[PDB]
């Protein structure tokens, strides 16, 4: 058996074809096993609607999750990603850094 804790990156992107759109992204990468819970949070509250979740695996069976959705950030709001995984003794919460 193998277990590997996910790497977690939280960042924002505009599609180049439409700069009127801002997306918040959680890239959860390289994890074993694939069982996982991933949420985006705004000011500590779960964002229910997340339009996109792209899931893949590598040759060695590691999982790669891109979880992302359109959002309209203000300087006031705190965004974060909350991950629950067998490798984590408590849920891991990773904040969005505004300048990313």
Author numbering: 0 to 99
Task: List sentences quoted exactly from the publication behind this structure.
By calculating the change in the protein intrinsic score upon all the possible single mutations at these seven sites, we suggest that the V85E β 2m variant should reduce the wild-type aggregation propensity, while two alternative specific mutations in the W60G β 2m variant (W60G-Y63W and W60G-N83V) are expected to weakly (the former) or largely (the latter) increase the W60G aggregation propensity. Indeed, the score of V85E β 2m is lower than that of W60G, the one of W60G-N83V is comparable to that of the wild-type while W60G-Y63W is slightly larger than that of W60G. In particular, for the crystal structures here reported of the W60G-Y63W and V85E mutants a closed AB loop conformation was observed; by contrast, the wild-type β 2m, W60G and W60G-N83V 3D structures exhibit an open AB loop conformation. Detailed inspection shows that the structure of the W60G-N83V mutant is perfectly superimposable onto that of W60G β 2m. In fact, in W60G the side chain of N83, which is located on the F-strand, although surrounded by two charged residues (E36 and R81), does not establish any hydrogen bond with the neighboring residues; thus, the N83V substitution leaves both the conformation of residue 83 and of the surrounding side chains unaffected. Conversely, introduction of the Y63W and N83V mutations (added to the W60G mutation) did not vary significantly the Tm value recorded for the W60G mutant.
